[PDB]
Each structure stands twice: as structure tokens, then as C-alpha cells.
Design an enzyme around this catalytic site. Structure first.
Site, PDB file in Angstrom:
ATOM      1  N   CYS A  86       0.790  -1.222   0.000  1.00  0.00           N
ATOM      2  CA  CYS A  86       0.000   0.000   0.000  1.00  0.00           C
ATOM      3  C   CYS A  86       0.839   1.297   0.000  1.00  0.00           C
ATOM      4  O   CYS A  86       1.553   1.600   0.965  1.00  0.00           O
ATOM      5  CB  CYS A  86      -0.990   0.016   1.175  1.00  0.00           C
ATOM      6  N   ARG A 132      -0.209   4.692   2.803  1.00  0.00           N
ATOM      7  CA  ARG A 132      -0.104   4.452   4.249  1.00  0.00           C
ATOM      8  C   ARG A 132       0.169   5.674   5.147  1.00  0.00           C
ATOM      9  O   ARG A 132       0.075   5.562   6.372  1.00  0.00           O
ATOM     10  CB  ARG A 132       0.884   3.299   4.520  1.00  0.00           C
ATOM     11  N   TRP A 137      -9.438   5.805  -1.010  1.00  0.00           N
ATOM     12  CA  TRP A 137      -9.718   6.473  -2.269  1.00  0.00           C
ATOM     13  C   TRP A 137      -8.644   6.040  -3.267  1.00  0.00           C
ATOM     14  O   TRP A 137      -7.628   5.481  -2.882  1.00  0.00           O
ATOM     15  CB  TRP A 137      -9.801   7.991  -2.089  1.00  0.00           C
ATOM     16  N   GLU A 184      -4.299   3.614 -10.835  1.00  0.00           N
ATOM     17  CA  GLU A 184      -5.053   2.356 -10.730  1.00  0.00           C
ATOM     18  C   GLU A 184      -6.134   2.283 -11.792  1.00  0.00           C
ATOM     19  O   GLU A 184      -6.356   1.220 -12.377  1.00  0.00           O
ATOM     20  CB  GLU A 184      -5.689   2.158  -9.350  1.00  0.00           C
TER      21      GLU A 184
END
Ligand code: HEM
Ligand code: HEM
Ligand SMILES: Cc1cc(N)nc(C[C@@H]2CNC[C@H]2NCCNCCc2cccc(F)c2)c1
Ligand SMILES: Cc1cc(N)nc(C[C@@H]2CNC[C@H]2NCCNCCc2cccc(F)c2)c1
Ligand SMILES: C[C@H](O)[C@H](O)[C@H]1CNc2nc(N)[nH]c(=O)c2N1
Ligand SMILES: C[C@H](O)[C@H](O)[C@H]1CNc2nc(N)[nH]c(=O)c2N1
Ligand SMILES: [Zn+2]
Lengths: 403, 405
Positions: B109, B112, B281, B286
Site C-alpha cells: 500500500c 499508508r 480512495w 489504478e
């Protein structure tokens, strides 16, 4: 037991059995992966590495088990037992060098691995001769812009003496001059080597693209300075196919990527000076050398020339400028009739290479982070391909800087 | 000198040592012989009890009460409960802490920096598939907040000995249908062929669009899954248009606002939360790079480059690079216009660098999966490309788990 290897675009699966021939440990353990880090004899150990390698060689020429194979193994045992070391026959050296390239996990150009000109420079006794040899390599490999892959192999390491070394990390690099105001003029990756040159007597220039002299070192002697004749060093002026103002930036790059600081290891023997060259993949110049913030760092200048909104990240001005710079590199090389490969063409051919090596050897060691290009990664097929990374011999390795 | 991984940033030349990795108690897939870092996918009282002790110790340290009688009483309460039932249960604030910690611990991730701001919805009272639906709808409403997106997680009851799992069959709360066509091609999202087919097998009347929102298949313990259609007014979507290319809007592309992972296992102190959907979000790459441009996803690169009139016949025109950039910019521009939270890959990575300093100071390192952290366009243009990273498994964690079917 052996790792399952998947391509996520196509759903295909292979198993890597080649990794079982690794005798050398990398940085990872089960507790933690360190695969993103850039950097990390006695008689019986050398002998067993020598045997492995002679085995490799006779197998490659389909003469495994033959008399010539048995006799050669004996020659090696005899030489090690008596002298603590041995020597390669030229043809073995040739095989070894090709295999080192084949085994290089960070190299995306490996489909070319079988096409390598090998200059045996093991009869080199001086920095002067090293220079003649280096100059011929450049002449050969450049070939008026039709680049040819080449390696020149200088005398191996020996127990009772210092190494033959090329101090420069490449045969061709641009000077980096530290200014009093702390900034660098030229290429910032080359500040130290520029300084070393100056310390050993080089008269410096004051441009952004002054080609550096070579510091060449024969065993246990001070390095010597040699200026490359400008005629031998092919450079490519950068222009853009549509943007006229681009050429005004005065950007340029050399044609010949030739690494000169890596050790070449074959059958336990070590070649501390063995420079090699192929040709560039455009992203090395267009993206890393020109756009890295710790390199020439030209992104902003270009984006301003493109009148982009440089105020916010979300305008993607960085991405937009990066593409034009990569395009300018490709266009300029194509215009100057000098070999280059773009990152799409290169990664596509690497995928074919992975397939060829799967059939040939049951795998291919590959370092995903280095194979995937620095822009447009997921747009290339290598992004979607799982890769197993490990160390095979013959190999290129890093070695300590000689100063 | 230090006997811990040395970590260098090659842009700035700065060095750190990761001491946090010493806390790892689960092995990854790498050995000294070979690095397997690029692979996407690589109880008994004794094992549970030590996992629990460690989590409880983690909890008491985070509130600065290590060694205290409350700490030692809670340990005592934990073992006595495992002693008599084979499992145990978390206090409310232990769950909240473990859910954040699991997010903080996730190597893949990039978002973070935000780990300390997570709304933890406790849904351990949930006892039907219908109730899961209510909880999920409340989750989506809260997280979506009309485009001002809020990080949230909903935690359903934990796996029990010899009782079925709570499971969400869908990999996300919001995903588009992928319909396998008569000519072998796929209409919609090819990534969702299986879940779409499962939805239809369980009585969903399918649509026929490129962007049909899927129903949820929700499974209560030991029951067949039940099918629930999300009320469309709950599913915020963003129509995609480009700031200066006027024809882009005419492609009819769109994406959902809310990225919500629903198939992962949340493990805390040995306890296993098989249904614990979490949402944040988007980072713009992506959608604009992976979901839209991947060859095995929507694959819209050629279409867009044709519209941009690029030379799609040769690699060296960088037509793929050019179109990708505009699709990404379209994503950013459209979300910004629609006032829906999104972060670009430059801001995202700049902020993850800061998160790395925070964590260096706080824990002595940060587990990170370089291949996943580096964005899929403009890699070396972002500062994370130049940052070495150490990857290792810490608990609490999110884990992949096998599909229920
Ligand atoms: C024929 C054209 C070639 C191309 C297009 C190519 C491409 C590349 C690229 C893009 C890299 C990563 C460089 C970086 O990011 O710094 C690389 C690394 C490497 N290449 Fe190749 N290569 C070629 C030929 C060769 C040859 C002839 C050899 C040796 C005989 C070789 C051996 C290596 C090694 C050892 C590395 C990693 C060492 C390093 O640069 O740190 N390659 N190559
Ligand atoms: C707040 C905004 C957030 C952003 C911008 C963000 C960004 C990202 C991105 C870009 C990925 C890689 C996904 C992929 O390539 O498919 C990822 C993965 C992941 N994220 Fe975050 N995230 C955010 C919030 C959260 C939250 C709230 C959680 C959980 C509480 C979370 C947990 C995870 C986990 C476990 C993964 C790895 C699982 C996977 O393979 O997708 N993230 N995130
Ligand atoms: C043969 C060939 C062809 C090609 N296209 N490309 C290449 C290597 C690239 C080119 N241009 C630089 C080479 N690669 C050097 C990589 N540097 C190692 C990291 C490092 C380590 C220590 C100090 C430091 F500053 C950096 C070779
Ligand atoms: C909360 C949150 C925010 C955010 N921005 N982003 C996320 C994860 C992303 C979102 N959208 C997809 C998620 N990540 C997908 C994980 N896939 C890898 C493993 C896998 C497993 C099975 C099949 C397969 F193809 C791949 C979460
Ligand atoms: C830290 C990280 O490993 C480092 O930036 C690597 C990543 N991948 C790379 N890949 C290539 N081809 N060349 C590089 O210099 C790098 N740098
Ligand atoms: C093979 C490779 O590991 C795989 O394609 C990974 C690479 N990095 C990624 N990084 C992110 N963020 N998301 C992904 O799906 C992937 N895919
Ligand atoms: Zn590894």
C-alpha cells in the site's frame, strides 16, 4: 520445491528448474526480501568452480565426456595443483564471456547474448597497450553508427599483485564539475571521476558535455591518463521531430554504452578489466540520464519550453515532458543512423528471450525492478511477467573502486 | 557496522537501517538461493496463544502500558479464554488498533501516510447475510460521503471452530460485470468473468453493458450465499472526460468512486476476520493505467491513440506512452471536476516518502514491496523509484485467502 512462474497478462505458467544450478547466495532470506537493493581462492574451491565451467564448455560444444574433455580437466587439475591458478583457452574465454551476459539478471538486451565479439587482450602488459586495445574496441563496436556488441578482456587477477583496472565506470562519460555555489555543471554522476582525472593531471573543460579521459591502471602502478581521440567518440545531437525549440537546448548523448568497471568471473578466474558494450535502450538516456533529479534533471526546463502548468503535479507535466524527451532521443538516433531500441521493442524481445531460455535451460534469472522500464512500465509485457532472480556463473559482478 | 539491512535512497544519497524487520514472525517466499519478490501470490492452542500474547503486547505498548497489571491481567484473561474455548475475543479498542496496524503493516500500500485515520466499523454482532448487506450499505454511504471519501473498514464476526465463515464472494464492494461473448471476447471487465458467472448462476438477471455494477454475493456462516443488488444511488461513479481533448467524453468511459477490497482476511493476534471489507480512495494510475490500459483489462490504449491520430503501427512513436498519459490525465481531471477524492501518482509517492521517515523514527523501518509501490507509469519520475525498500511480513496483517467456491 521449484518456483511456479506466472505471466498475468496471458495466464501462462512455467516452472524454474534452472535456479537449482545457483552456487552463490543473494541478499534475501525467508525473513525479508532485499531484491530492491542496488549493491550487496583456496585450491579445492577454485578447482570445483573450474571443473563446473569446463563441464559447461564441453557440453556447449556437445563433446561432453570425450577425450578432449577429460584431457582438458586434467590440464586444469595439474595447473591448479602446481601453481594455485590456471588459464583459459581463447575459445573457452569466448564461451564464458557470452554466458556471463546470458546470465546477467539486470540485462533486458539478452536476446542478443549469442552475438558478441570477444577481443582477447590477455597479452597486455601496460596501460599504454590497454589504451590501444580500448580504442580498437570503440572503433569496432561503433562501426559508423551500426553498433556491434563487443567485449575486450584484459589479464586476469593474480595472487601476488594488483589488478589491471579501468577507473572509469564507462569508456565514454561526460564530465561533472562541482561549482563553488554547490551545484554541478555537466553530469552529476561523474563528479568524483572528473575530480580524479583532474588530480592526475587532466586539463578540464567547462561544458555540459565534455567527454572524459580514461584513467588506466596496470598492476601496482599509478593510473595513467589517456584522452580519447574525438573522432572515435560518436555523439548524437538531440532534436525533436515536431518541436523546433528542442534542438536549442543543445542536448546530446554518446552512442556507445560501454561498462568498464565490472569484474568478469569465469570458472573461478577473475577479470578485473573487461569492458563491454552493446547499444542503448532509449529510456536509459531519455528517462534516467536526462530526467533523474540527481542527473541532468531537465524535466522542468522542457516542461516550461512546452508551456505546461508546472504548478501542480496533477497536470502531469512531468509525464508529458518525459515522453517528448524519450521521443527526441529515439528520433535523433534514427536520424543519425545510430542503433537504439525503444523500451517496447526491447521488452517484447526479452519476452521471446524468456521463452527461448525456458526451452533451452528451464529458466532465466531476471531482476524485475531492472527489467521493467523507468516509464510506462505496465504498458510493457515484462511488467506482467513474474521473474525469479538468482546468481549463475559465469557472471558479471561489481567490485570495489580502486582508489 | 549495524547488523540490519542498510537502505539507501539513490536520489538523495541518504542511508537508513531497518531494525523493524527483526519483529517479523512469518516467512516470505525468498531464500538466499533465489529472490521470489516479484510473485503476486507466492487453530491449535499453542500457535494461537503466542500470536495472541504478541498482539496484546503490541496493544499495551501502543498505549504505553507494557508490564502494567492491566497488561498482565489482559494476558491472563486471553489465555484463560483460550484454555476453555480454544479461541478468544478482542476488546473494541483492540480491534480498532489492530485494524489500523494491519493497514500500516501492508507492504503493497502506497497510501499508508493515512493509516492513523481509519473509521473502524465493528460488525461482530452481524448474524445474517441480510445484515451484512445493511452493514455494507452503511459502509459505502459513510466512506463515499458524497465524494469527500473517508477511509473505513467494517469487521464481521471472526472465524470460529467448526462453524462456517462470513464471506463476501466479490473481490470488491464495487466492480463491473464482465460478460463472456459468443465470439470469445469480453464485454465489460475481463477481470470479473468468474464473479459475473457466479452471480448469474445464483439468479442475477444480467445486463449487457461495459460498466454494469455487479451485485454482491454475501455468505453468512454455513449457508448458501445470498444475492443483493446495491441501490444505484449509493454507487458514486465518475464519467470520464479530458481537459482539452473534446472527443474523450464521447468514448463513454467511467469509473466508480470507491475502491473497497472485500475478499481479504484480516488477521489480528491469531484471530481471523474472513469478512472485513476496507475502502480508501484511488490513486489515479489504478484506473487510468491499469484498469483501463492493461491488455487483459479494458485495453483502451489503441482506441485512444487512434482518436489522437498517433502512429499505432510502430513502437517507436511512443503512441502507447502518449495515450496512457492522456487517459491518466482524463481520470484526474474528471474526478476533480466531479469533486471526488483522488490522488495522482506524484503526490501519492511524495507522501509515501514522508510516511517512510515517519516510520523510520517511530518503528525503525517500513515493510514495502517496491514493485507495487512504484507506479505503473512514469516510474523513475517519482521519488519511490530511487528508494531501496525491505519487504517482510508483520502482524496484524491483511492476507489473501482462497475463494469460497
Ligand atoms: C545489445 C544491446 C544491449 C541492450 C539494449 C542492453 C540493455 C540493458 C539495460 C537497459 C540495462 C540496465 C542499465 C541501467 O539501467 O543502468 C542493462 C544492464 C546490463 N547489461 Fe545489457 N544491454 C545490451 C547489451 C549487453 C552486453 C553486450 C553485455 C555484456 C556482454 C550486457 C551486460 C549487461 C550487464 C552485466 C548489465 C547490468 C550491469 C549494470 O549495468 O549495472 N548487456 N542492459
Ligand atoms: C486512503 C487512500 C489509499 C490509497 C491512495 C491506497 C493506495 C493503494 C494502491 C495504489 C494499492 C495497490 C493496488 C493495486 O495495484 O491493485 C494499494 C494496496 C493495498 N491497500 Fe491501500 N490505499 C489507500 C487506503 C487503504 C486502506 C484504508 C486500507 C485498509 C484499511 C488499505 C490497504 C491496502 C492493502 C492491504 C493493499 C494490498 C492488497 C492488494 O493487493 O490490493 N489501503 N493501496
Ligand atoms: C552493454 C550495455 C548496454 C546498455 N544499453 N546498457 C548498459 C549498462 C548501463 C548503461 N549506462 C550505465 C550502465 N549501468 C550502470 C548501472 N549502475 C550501477 C549502480 C551503481 C553502483 C555503484 C555506483 C553508482 F553510482 C551506481 C550496458
Ligand atoms: C482500500 C484500497 C484503496 C486503493 N486505492 N486500492 C486498493 C486495492 C486495489 C483497488 N482495486 C484492486 C485492489 N488490488 C487488487 C489486488 N490484486 C493482487 C492479487 C490478485 C488476487 C487475485 C486475482 C488477481 F488478478 C490479483 C484498496
Ligand atoms: C532502488 C532501486 O532498486 C533502484 O532505483 C533501481 C530500480 N530499477 C532500476 N532499473 C534499471 N534498469 N536501472 C536502474 O538504475 C534501476 N535502479
Ligand atoms: C509480475 C508483477 O509482480 C506483477 O505484474 C505486479 C507488479 N507490480 C504491481 N504493482 C501494483 N501496484 N499492482 C499490481 O497489480 C502489480 N502487478
Ligand atoms: Zn527477494
Amino acid at each position: 520445491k521449484f518456483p511456479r512462474v506466472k505471466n498475468w497478462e496471458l495466464g501462462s505458467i512455467t516452472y524454474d528448474t534452472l535456479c537449482a544450478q545457483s552456487q552463490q547466495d543473494g541478499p534475501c532470506t525467508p525473513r525479508r526480501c532485499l531484491g530492491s537493493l542496488v549493491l550487496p581462492p583456496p585450491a579445492e574451491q577454485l578447482l570445483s568452480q573450474a571443473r563446473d565451467f569446463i563441464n559447461q564448455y564441453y557440453s556447449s560444444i556437445k563433446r561432453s565426456g570425450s577425450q578432449a574433455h577429460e584431457e582438458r580437466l586434467q590440464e586444469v587439475e595439474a595447473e591448479v595443483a602446481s601453481t594455485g591458478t590456471y588459464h583459459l583457452r581463447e575459445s573457452e574465454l569466448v564461451f564464458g564471456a557470452k554466458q556471463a551476459w546470458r546470465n546477467a539478471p539486470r540485462c533486458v538486451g539478452r536476446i542478443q547474448w549469442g552475438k558478441l565479439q570477444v577481443f582477447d587482450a590477455r597479452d597486455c602488459s601496460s596501460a599504454q597497450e590497454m589504451f590501444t586495445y580500448i580504442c580498437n574496441h570503440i572503433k569496432y563496436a561503433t562501426n559508423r553508427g551500426n553498433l556491434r556488441s563487443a567485449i575486450t578482456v584484459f589479464p586476469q587477477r593474480a595472487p601476488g599483485r594488483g589488478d589491471f583496472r579501468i577507473w572509469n565506470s564507462q569508456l565514454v562519460r561526460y564530465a561533472g564539475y562541482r561549482q563553488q555555489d554547490g551545484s554541478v555543471r555537466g553530469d552529476p554522476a561523474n563528479v568524483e571521476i572528473t575530480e580524479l582525472c583532474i588530480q592526475h593531471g587532466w586539463t578540464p573543460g567547462n561544458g555540459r558535455f565534455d567527454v572524459l579521459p580514461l584513467l588506466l591502471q596496470a598492476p601496482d602502478e599509478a593510473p595513467e591518463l589517456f584522452v580519447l581521440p574525438p573522432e572515435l567518440v560518436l555523439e548524437v545531437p538531440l532534436e525533436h521531430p515536431t518541436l523546433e525549440w528542442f534542438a536549442a537546448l543543445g542536448l546530446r548523448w554518446y552512442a556507445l554504452p560501454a561498462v568498464s568497471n565490472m569484474l568478469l568471473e569465469i570458472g573461478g578466474l577473475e577479470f578485473s578489466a573487461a569492458p563491454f558494450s552493446g547499444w542503448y535502450m532509449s529510456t536509459e538516456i531519455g528517462t534516467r540520464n536526462l530526467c533523474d533529479p540527481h542527473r541532468y534533471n531537465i524535466l522542468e526546463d522542457v516542461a516550461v519550453c512546452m508551456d505546461l502548468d508546472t504548478r501542480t503535479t496533477s497536470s502531469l507535466w512531468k509525464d508529458k515532458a518525459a515522453v517528448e524527451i524519450n521521443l527526441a532521443v529515439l528520433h535523433s538516433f534514427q536520424l543519425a543512423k545510430v542503433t537504439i531500441v525503444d523500451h517496447h521493442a526491447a521488452t517484447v524481445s526479452f519476452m521471446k528471450h524468456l521463452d527461448n531460455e525456458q526451452k533451452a535451460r528451464g529458466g532465466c534469472p531476471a531482476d524485475w525492478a531492472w527489467i521493467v522500464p523507468p516509464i510506462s512500465g505496465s504498458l510493457t509485457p515484462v511488467f506482467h511477467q513474474e521473474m525469479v532472480n538468482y546468481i549463475l556463473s559465469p557472471a558479471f559482478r561489481y567490485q570495489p573502486d580502486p582508489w
